[PDB]
Amino acid sequence: GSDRSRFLEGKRAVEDKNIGPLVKTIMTRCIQCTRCIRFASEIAGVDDLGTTGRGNDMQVGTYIEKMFMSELSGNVIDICPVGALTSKPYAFTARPWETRKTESIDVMDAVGSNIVVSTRTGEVMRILPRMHEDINEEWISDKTR
Amino acid sequence: KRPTVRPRSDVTHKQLSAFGEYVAEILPKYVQQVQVSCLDELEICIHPDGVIPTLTFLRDHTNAQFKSLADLTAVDVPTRQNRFEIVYNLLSLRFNSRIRVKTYADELTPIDSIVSVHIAANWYEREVWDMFGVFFFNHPDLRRILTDYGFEGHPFRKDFPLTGYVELRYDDEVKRVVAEPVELAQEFRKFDLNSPWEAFPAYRQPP
Amino acid sequence: SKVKQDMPPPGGYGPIDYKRNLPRRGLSGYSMFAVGIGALIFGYW
Amino acid sequence: EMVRKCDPHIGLLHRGTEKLIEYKTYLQALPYFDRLDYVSMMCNEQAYSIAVEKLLNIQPPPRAQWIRVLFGEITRILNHIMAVTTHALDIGAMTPFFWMFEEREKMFEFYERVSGARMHAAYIRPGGVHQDLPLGLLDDIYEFSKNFSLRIDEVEEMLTNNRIWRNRTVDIGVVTAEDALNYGFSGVMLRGSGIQWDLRKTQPYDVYDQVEFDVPIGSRGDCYDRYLCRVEEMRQSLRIIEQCLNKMPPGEIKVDDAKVSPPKRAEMKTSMESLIHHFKLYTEGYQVPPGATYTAIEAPKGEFGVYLVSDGSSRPYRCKIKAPGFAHLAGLDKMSKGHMLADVVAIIGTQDIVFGEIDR
Amino acid sequence: ASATRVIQKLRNWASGQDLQAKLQLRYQEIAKRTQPPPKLPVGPSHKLSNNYYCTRDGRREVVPPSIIMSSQKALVSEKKAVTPAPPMKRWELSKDQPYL
Amino acid sequence: TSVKPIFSRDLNEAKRRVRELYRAWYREVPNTVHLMQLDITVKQGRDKVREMFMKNAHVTDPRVVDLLVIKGKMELQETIKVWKQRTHVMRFFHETETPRPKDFLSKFYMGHDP
Amino acid sequence: TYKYVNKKEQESEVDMKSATDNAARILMWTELIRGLGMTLSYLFREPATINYPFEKGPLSPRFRGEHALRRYPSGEERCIACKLCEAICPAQAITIEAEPRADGSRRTTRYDIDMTKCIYCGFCQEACPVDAIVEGPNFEFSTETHEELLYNKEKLLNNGDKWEAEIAANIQADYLYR
Amino acid sequence: GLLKKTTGLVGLAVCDTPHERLTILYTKTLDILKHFPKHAAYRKYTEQITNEKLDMVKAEPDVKKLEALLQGGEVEEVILQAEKELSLARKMLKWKPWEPLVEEPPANQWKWPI
Amino acid sequence: QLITVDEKLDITTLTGVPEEHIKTRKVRIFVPARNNMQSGVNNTKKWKMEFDTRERWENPLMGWASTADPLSNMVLTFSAKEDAIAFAEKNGWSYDVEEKKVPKPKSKSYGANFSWNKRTRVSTK
Amino acid sequence: GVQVSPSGEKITHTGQVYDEKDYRRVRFVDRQKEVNENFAIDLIAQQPVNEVEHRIIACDGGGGALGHPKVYINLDKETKTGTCGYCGLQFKQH
Amino acid sequence: DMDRFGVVFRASPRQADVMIVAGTLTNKMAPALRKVYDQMPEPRYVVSMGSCANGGGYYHYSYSVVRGCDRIVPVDIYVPGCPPTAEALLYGILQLQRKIKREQKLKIWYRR
Ligand code: SF4
Ligand code: SF4
């Protein structure tokens, strides 16, 4: 990617949606990639997240003020590349390059989903998922994370 | 035109490349994998048993008067079975060229000394031993040059922790400086900075 | 407005002395023996 | 009082900089180099800057090069001033050390004005220079330069034709030309013997190829001839400043390549890509392509070279530093043969040694 | 500028060379501490058009070290004697102060 | 198998060097304790020399033993001359560190160590 | 181009006058009385010394000294816990443990700098995208115990409710260069 | 007529009689170069250099034009190169570099990066 | 010449590591998992080698995290698993290896999103 | 806006205080626990909420390069008031 | 000038009152610094100068640096910086002089 900007105009902003106590939606920084929409309607089966409008105004989110709460709802944090929607408990607590990644496993359920317990100076900061194609196919529940 | 990209004087690439081959076929018994980098610097890899003949040749030969030993470093690479890759940088003062000579070693595979050829190696030659534990044959003195008189270790090895295993402090019970195992007040913070994206496609390693 | 960047003034600066300048000083070489011997002979008298 | 054997036990200042570099990004490791040869401060980081530039395959802008040569010569005057004086302090002539340190203090204002520190200016980044010269600082450098050649003469009067200084320095530390190369000597030690060598005139790395100057060469190898080489280099370095002042082209100070050098503060706060590059260059650091280089520059002590190995990451793999003093002090055994204890004291200085670079 | 002109003569004579025009300490030749605002020039690559990074990306122009006579492969090693470079030219005496 | 030798045809030959280095230390303990004013007596100094050898009596590689002997001679050279002072020689005796326990229950009481 | 420094040009040319000049030089210490002359001149010069407590040596706006956490004119803290001043610090002197402030803002709960680890390199002030941390001109803060050099957010805001009358002028006079 | 009463470098004599030391040394190298195996590259390349520098020594009798024509510095520097090169030929005869490679390197020894 | 040595290579005494970090210490040879927040796979491809984590406690004075072991920060990178194993055995540390977990190639077709009778039909765009 | 804990110690703007029974309070004996009395929660609230005409308003620290990076707020919400993320300023329309 | 405050440099520790530990203190040098500190006749003072001497400074995490001379000698005044400005050390020396200005050693002697 280019190393400088030719933009000389005013950017856009988007109304921010309060869609629950896990995810923190700051939709000004969405790149409208439709990953969250597909994951919601193909893995979690929540089918309550979609686009809206057209043009630059293609806001993504629930049209009405509704709770996007499901057993697999914290995984939207992982899937979204940009920080458009991120976890609330983790909000501002730490940063990646400070954290040490260690391998572990979930014990909150009987499936033993793999885990990356990121610790920063002797304390647990977040519980990320690992890839394992037999159990925990890159997704982990909300209870574990 | 391109003020950012370095000017490329391709003339000195041909000259070095010709000389690398000339050294390759005038000393085949040891020479391995001569190469020239983008930055126009030659690099000859030598079997460890041929350090003296190669270094003696490159100094005395009329067409290669490499009389100045710039430095004698050592790169630790745990990946390869022969870890320590001793490096010799040489300078001419006649043909105005720099040539690198490389050999491999191991913590149980010493290398013949060079103080006979280049006396400059003498102190560099211990520095490698003190820092990497690469014993060198036929050296006169060969003692630690940098580390304390009581390090049971080799600091520059990649398996040596940065903080070390011992700290010094003053004790009144014994009225002298004592050594105790290291207990840092703030642990060194290792930053996982590596990016997960192919910065340089020209160096891809297929699986 | 125009770029101001701390450049040397037009035509550069004045020259800077950079060579050895050790003045030559002292009596002739015979005068200083003449004074010394003259002082030495007048003293004995 | 005759020395039969010298065994320099260096290691009293082994901080272990080379290992601490491997855990630090390229920009993070820059101040390590200001602290190796701590009397030619910003002429060390030039060696680091040139090495990283070579691997990155970038070159600095024309204005930056002149600043790096202009300030690369103030380091030479700074370092030679100490070498002439602290050498004389041990011999006994304390007065010249106090005169010329009224000039070091003047020049340290230039560092404190281009950077913010008197001594360790982390000013010469690989991507050119960190920050532009403040208005009128060239005028102050010029006003310094005019008065300077008078200062060097005042010292030259005191301890250049004295019986006491010539007898304490002539015929001492005679190093044969053949042994100078075999012992790996470089810099003034080579030139004192008679060997014609200077990296600024044989392997140019900056605008040094467009600037004219003379390299002093000595007839005999004694400490006296290489004293004159140090004093005469100040004269020639003071000649480069005249030229750098008189041609300091306008332009940028750092390469316009936001993936290696940071963008300006103003663009950081209005454009997105500039913020991303500012954010990544100061967290991970720019990545240099895998490779190995040995770049050498004519530091005032001599051939200061850095051997950077690298992998496809933001932190180097091995950074060996060819301190010019390592070879000189190793050869101290041969210099002091049939010479008294006081002569050894007069030979430590004539090598112009600091143990930050040796031990490093 | 407070030497009284009789000590100014004594120090000028004793030193051997005039120095009241070349004093160490600075009086009023130094640039004023406060300076007017600058506007540093914007360097190249701010063209805003025809400036694609793929043209002047020097970091990607580096290629792995070219290899000659690789042992792993079977590279092939009347020939004239070769040198690393043409011999360095002998320097010439300086013309300003050849001898000092 | 198939590893070049270093000052050792076989283990027995390298054991002679170790026995040569031991005779160099046993003859040296009574000279360091006096040349540098150590607070130990020669009888217990020789015990530490022997102890530092049993620490490495389980090795059997000829190459390793030669490197151990080479380092020991360097360690001896720095002590024959007074390069290493009382601070360095008394570093072997560990006269300050608390004796780390061995019983599992004692380890369980203090710290999380295995 | 080289330059001979101690090589005689032409020799074997000496007469009684030239011979007697050298005799006068050696036999009456002419070139030692010449060295005394220079020192005698220096006695009749104004010393460069300055009364430190009462007149303090010159500095520059870019000077790098004691640290300081700045605030916006309204009073709000500038630091936003982006934590890339501890990413670039090449001594790991800075530590941050920011959490949300309970009013929604991203602010720090710990900003301790170890001034015994810091090397006064200035990388942290050029990395901060809000100028939250700066380095004022205060070079005189030596202490009588190691502990007072372990600065914490409370000290760093005090240095920053104190030197803003100075810090603002310094930044306002060199930000264009940055 | 001149003899450069002082040479540029220190430790080197003035060598008042050139064109005889050079002819002797270059002739000696050829004789030792004649004992090498014919296929060895050192014999081929070193002959091509010594013979070239032997013609030039016989060509011009003036030394000042010889130093410039024979680009090897002053005559003394050139002579000390013939001696050192002459020493190399003797050492080459015993090391036998022309033989094929011995113990090609292991799988990855020059694979950078890692 | 050459020598015969059937004993496993063992250099624990030469490196001079204290015995307290030879027997007790445990080494983990693994290929680090991709940071699922990002979709790049460059952090992988290199076998790493950490050490068993040890006690970290808050400093009583500042709250910094202070440690009593030197090996915690050390990570060594290897090209292949076999090279890493030799290093572990060669230095006498105990090691355990986690096998590579490479993703299984998947059949992604843009046409399946719009199918006439299957259940893959995507309800949006 | 500094409040004293029941043990008499002063609570900082981060909410910290040492319990009455904590031994780490010794360091303050014969000395003082410096706390900055200019809190940040209170000072930012005392500012007036600015009213603008557009639905998207920029925010920087005020001096341009001396402020914070150029950000854009959305002011369509009426129940709440848009807040700049860097500085705690607030904006409304109408 | 330090001669203004009657401050003169002397090589022998036997004739030195204060010791300015300026520069990185390494393991190899640590035994030497304590020895030299012991030789100074009491009363003696130590003025740790710079980051490398106060704490470990830039080399806090190296294997051969004692993290601050406070581990080897008892320091009276710490002068922060890297390097401290010549004024910064002079403020340290003056602030050391004001330390001796309030000793109270003979006053307590009357109380013993
Ligand atoms: S995944 Fe993130 S960036 Fe993509 S559409 Fe959803 S919110 Fe926007
Ligand atoms: S970190 Fe990424 S998602 Fe967040 S603001 Fe920057 S570019 Fe956008």
Ligand code: SF4
């Ligand atoms: S000045 Fe440099 S060393 Fe000090 S805290 Fe800032 S970044 Fe770290």
Ligand code: SF4
């Ligand atoms: S001081 Fe600046 S760089 Fe450091 S965390 Fe705060 S905002 Fe970020």
Ligand code: SF4
């Ligand atoms: S100036 Fe800085 S790096 Fe140098 S010794 Fe002092 S604290 Fe250490």
Ligand SMILES: [Zn+2]
């Ligand atoms: Zn704002």
